[PDB]
Design an enzyme around this catalytic site. Structure first.
Site, PDB file in Angstrom:
ATOM      1  N   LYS A  62       0.818  -1.140   0.000  1.00 50.77           N
ATOM      2  CA  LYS A  62       0.000   0.000   0.000  1.00 50.77           C
ATOM      3  C   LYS A  62       0.872   1.214   0.000  1.00 50.77           C
ATOM      4  CE  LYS A  62      -2.975   2.912   2.982  1.00 50.77           C
ATOM      5  NZ  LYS A  62      -2.165   4.012   2.414  1.00 50.77           N
ATOM      6  N   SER A  63       1.174   1.716  -1.192  1.00 50.51           N
ATOM      7  CA  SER A  63       1.986   2.914  -1.340  1.00 50.51           C
ATOM      8  C   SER A  63       1.259   4.117  -0.759  1.00 50.51           C
ATOM      9  CB  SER A  63       2.283   3.161  -2.818  1.00 50.51           C
ATOM     10  OG  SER A  63       1.099   3.114  -3.595  1.00 50.51           O
TER      11      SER A  63
END
Lengths: 368, 4
Positions: A62-63
């Site tokens: 999850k950037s």
């Protein structure tokens, strides 16, 4: 003195354009024009550990960045003008000038995509030399070339995007270097692992990222695309991600005799903004001697200012950075919410321990 | 100098 990114490359579109766009998209997907067609995940709790055993999942890093849908269409004003628009969950439309998307096997190069809605995230990568590069990572596709894949499953949704958009983009990129170097950002498909590939993300993918990160995302591959809150879409985050901003106060105890020795470690009191002018004592910020000598090494005022803190593995708040921008600390509501997020959710350990079971359960329900 |  620790303190403090990415922004949308486009410029805010006029209202009489975004209204037409909203209507067009609404007619395409069959939704309300003002309602955001995108999906939003739910907090990964304990009950999801079982879920990963009952369905096929895809996991990906999850950037941290700006989540916004990309829209390939024709310009609202001019009749035939290929245009790309980025819009967030707050329905703020940005017109991205200076960008195009090649069509598969297009000799002429005059063909362009219309009615194409992609779901992705805008991140900022750091390359050797401090050289930065803005990037758009696609993790889903709502519609492609006039067809709504929201009724379909994830493999087809990413498949059509891979065939008709990403592949021609790569084919074009490898031949046209200087042309590609003019793009406001690089569009690419997000690297995704199987639901049990968590370990691989931890020891290989994440530490080699060129952009920031905060947790993981689990996307069910057996569910259709759902506008709004998706129960199948899970967002997981370790305890250290839940940061709260407090008001820091250095309490030096009154000595028995003589003036106060400020070289000695004081009490680091953290306060929460409740009312408008009223704060309240919450907890203590743990600081060891090395960290204390570290704080005095800045030679800056430490007391009476906003600080960002996180819960360590010992369940005590540690200093992270100052918050020179914040006018007040996090409201008691926000603090309560974050505390609830920390109270719930699965630990990294208890999540990892379930991986070998998810792997075998996946290979068990597998289609011959 | 605050509440609680």
């Amino acid at each position: 003195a620790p303190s403090e990114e990415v922004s949308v490359p486009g410029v805010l579109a006029p209202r009489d354009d975004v209204r037409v766009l909203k209507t067009r998209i609404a007619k395409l997907l069959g939704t309300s024009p003002d309602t955001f067609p995108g999906s939003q995940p739910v907090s990964f709790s304990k009950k999801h550990l079982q879920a990963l055993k009952e369905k096929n999942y895809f996991v990906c890093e999850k950037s941290d960045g700006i989540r916004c849908l990309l829209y390939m269409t024709e310009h609202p004003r001019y009749e035939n003008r290929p245009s790309v628009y980025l819009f967030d969950r707050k329905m703020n439309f940005y017109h991205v000038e200076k960008i195009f998307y090649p069509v598969e096997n297009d000799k002429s190069g005059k063909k362009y995509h219309v009615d194409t809605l992609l779901d992705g995230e805008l991140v900022l990568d750091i390359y050797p030399g401090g050289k930065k590069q803005l990037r758009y990572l696609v993790f889903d596709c709502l519609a492609c070339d006039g067809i709504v894949y929201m009724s379909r499953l994830l493999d087809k949704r990413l498949g059509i995007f891979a065939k008709s958009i990403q592949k021609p983009l790569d084919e074009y990129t490898k031949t046209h270097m200087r042309e590609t170097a003019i793009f406001p950002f690089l569009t690419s498909l997000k690297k995704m692992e199987l639901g049990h590939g968590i370990l691989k993300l931890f020891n290989e993918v994440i530490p080699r990222l060129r952009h920031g990160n905060d947790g993981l995302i689990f996307t069910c591959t057996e569910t259709p695309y759902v506008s709004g809150t998706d129960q199948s879409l899970l967002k997981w985050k370790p305890k250290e991600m839940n940061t709260i901003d407090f008001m820091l106060k250095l309490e030096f105890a009154q000595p028995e005799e003589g003036d106060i020795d400020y070289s000695a470690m004081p009490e680091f009191q953290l306060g929460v903004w409740e009312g408008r002018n009223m704060y309240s004592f919450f907890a203590f910020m743990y600081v060891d001697e090395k960290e204390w000598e570290k704080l005095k090494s800045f030679n800056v005022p430490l007391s009476e200012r906003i600080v960002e803190c996180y819960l360590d593995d010992e369940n005590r708040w540690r200093f992270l950075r100052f918050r020179d921008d914040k006018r007040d600390a996090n409201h008691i509501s926000t603090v309560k919410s974050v505390l609830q997020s920390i109270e719930d959710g699965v630990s990294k350990e208890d999540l990892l321990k379930e991986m070998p079971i998810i792997r075998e359960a996946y290979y068990n329900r597998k289609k011959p | 100098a605050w509440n609680s």
